[model samples]
Target: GSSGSSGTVASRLSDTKAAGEVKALDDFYKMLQHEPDRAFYGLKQVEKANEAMAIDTLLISDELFRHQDVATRSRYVRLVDSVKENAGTVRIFSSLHVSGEQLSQLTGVAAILRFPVPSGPSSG
Candidate 1:
């Protein structure tokens, strides 16, 4: 039993806590550094929000995703995929959070960095 905005997907990983290990927190900071255009609401706050909101999935940049050691990636992949399969949602940003001109700055960054979910019949 989950719901959100009219079109927004409900997350599946609700109440799941952030790994909270040093490396994971570090990665979040790194993501903010590399993509200055997008403000990370901060790992601690986001995690707390997730706890409050029952967030099911976490979306982050592919760059950060790649930086994770194999073990982390494997674990996250399994978790994220499983959540999606169960009708939970995780969204990574493809565009910058800034308005207008600042957002355009992300153009130099690879689109692959955006972590957009592949289009599906229901997604379009």
Candidate 2:
């Protein structure tokens, strides 16, 4: 039938990326990879994370808890809790944060997953 389902999906994902609203996605992952610390936490990052509006979910690794101080940990926990409470999906990576932990943890850290925007054609 030559259906463009895969292409459509790819197109939508690309559009979402170009819009620059999707945070915590792979694009952000690439951005963070270039950093020296290669870690992210707290509200400051959240504000930046929020700017990538396409992010509707987050995955955190337990290592974030291991290396960070209580203050940073508390902030992360609070943020995750708050976002999830609002119906967002927050998946915490249970594995310990090690050399490769972040990759296994937050799915390589810095991700912005864009959920499908509902359709109805309603005005705001």
Candidate 3:
């Protein structure tokens, strides 16, 4: 009886892990879907813009590219290429002027960008 209960508990743990991964993936999808064009454009503007900004942009783009579908990934590739063509033309400072609401919006974007995407379907 104890062995059977242990098996049930293990099964529940597996289910919980699976659900968490799915939720994370879904949240990632929603973030990307919210303002894809705007997000991509922001990524482009920040590419190589500055040390801190570039690192953040690349980190987000890399993680997002990893989990996106083929179509989304393809779009990102094109946008990246477009930005690369005109890279180094834009410069953004870490303390650049921004309104409170704008700062909040940028912070929201950063939150999703900083999230680690799960590597495999069953892993988070």
Candidate 4:
């Protein structure tokens, strides 16, 4: 005559962990829906907070492929590719250890490279 109650401590912990993962995934989805660019930046934040969790969350979800917008799908695909190609670098950049000066330098270089030069002198 065994009891039907099966509320084990381990099972409870597992359930809690699963719930947390689901919540995180949902939050990430919301971020993507509301602001894709912010979602991209959020990846770094997630990685910084928990590298393993970030990897798991990104890998486990197929929702990205289901996105209707090609641009959104492409952006997510690029992120996934980068993560697969160099998770270490992604994690490193996600970390808070990188200095603001380094970020500013990177931004400055990008801006300079993107700036269009004058094609010719004013005709007036």
Candidate 5:
């Protein structure tokens, strides 16, 4: 019964309670749009969204560290670094909340764009 884990240090998500963080996630859900031409999930696909500079809000889950040889984590670390530079909003969903779990369920590296990209990579 070690669902018996102790609580985290500060008073935040769990301490405060929430329907908690429903806005952007709701927006993300809506972007699924019966078709989802606007949302991209997973690292590679979201990178495709990022490449177009079309990302408005980038959603990430705090629990996504399993790829750590240290190398892969280092690689992904730089991605958010630039999003800050480009003024894109990066929302890191805390694993403490159901919201984060909702995001984690979907591969963690997800984004909804400033505008939808035109389907295929049209760089040619």
Candidate 6:
């Protein structure tokens, strides 16, 4: 017998992670604007956060990891591993969605931190 529904969706009304992903993005941006120290974007900033074990939720565009040369991709993977090692929450967002697209525009990286640990200007 032929399979009935390939059923990536039996009901197209709502997606499983749809609502939460939207809400999570809002919270991220909210903190980003109101409290710059607690939220960050860009590879450099995120790497700094990871160095301090300060990532609360890491929002990365999946496309950033995929569609890249393997050697360079390892850089991203290393961040994920160290983050996971320190109990950091890592969220790889789908680039197809608006949230991911926006994040991609923001250099494909961002994070909400565990605390405000500022790394001051490099003027020693």
Runs in model 3 deviating more than 4 A are: 1-59, 89-124
How many backbone clashes can be found in candidate 3?
0
Give stretches of model 1 more than 4 Å off. 1-53, 94-124
Question: Predictions ranked by TM-score, top down?
Answer: 6, 5, 2, 1, 4, 3
Q: If scored against the real structure, what TM-score would every candidate get? A: 0.30, 0.42, 0.26, 0.28, 0.70, 0.76
lDDT of each: 0.35, 0.43, 0.32, 0.33, 0.64, 0.71
Compose the digit string of candidate 3's lDDT tens values, residues 1-124.
2222212111123244333433333343344444332222244333323322222232122433443588656644554454345341212112222222232343312212332232211213
Residues 1-124 of candidate 6: C-alpha lDDT, one tens digit per residue: 5344332322233365654455556666766655657777887788898988888877777777675689667877788778899898877778777778777656877877878658632223
Instruction: Tell me the tens digit of each residue's lDDT in model 2 across 98-121.
Output: 323535543333333353223211
Question: How many clashes in each candidate?
Answer: 6, 11, 0, 0, 0, 0
List candidate 4 stretches off by more than 4 Å: 1-60, 88-124
**Candidate that beats the other on lDDT, 1 or 5, i.e. the better one:** 5
Measured by TM-score, the strongest candidate is 6
Best by lDDT: 6
After superposition, candidate 5 runs with Cα above 4 Å error: 1-21, 65-67, 120-124
Q: For candidate 5, what is the TM-score?
A: 0.70
Show pairs that collide, candidate 1.
Answer: 11-89, 12-56, 12-88, 13-56, 14-54, 14-56
Query: What is the Cα-based lDDT of residue 44 in candidate 2?
Result: 54
**How well is each residue in 1-124 modelled by candidate 1, as lDDT tens digits?**
3334334222233222332222222343344444422222424333333334333334543443444588755644554454455554554433233221222333211111123122211112
Shift in Å, residue 30, candidate 5? 0.8
lDDT of 4 by residue, 19-121 (tens): 4443433443444434332232333342332323233334223444335789866754566554455442221111122222332232201100011122221
lDDT of 3: 0.32
- Candidates, ranked, lDDT: 6, 5, 2, 1, 4, 3
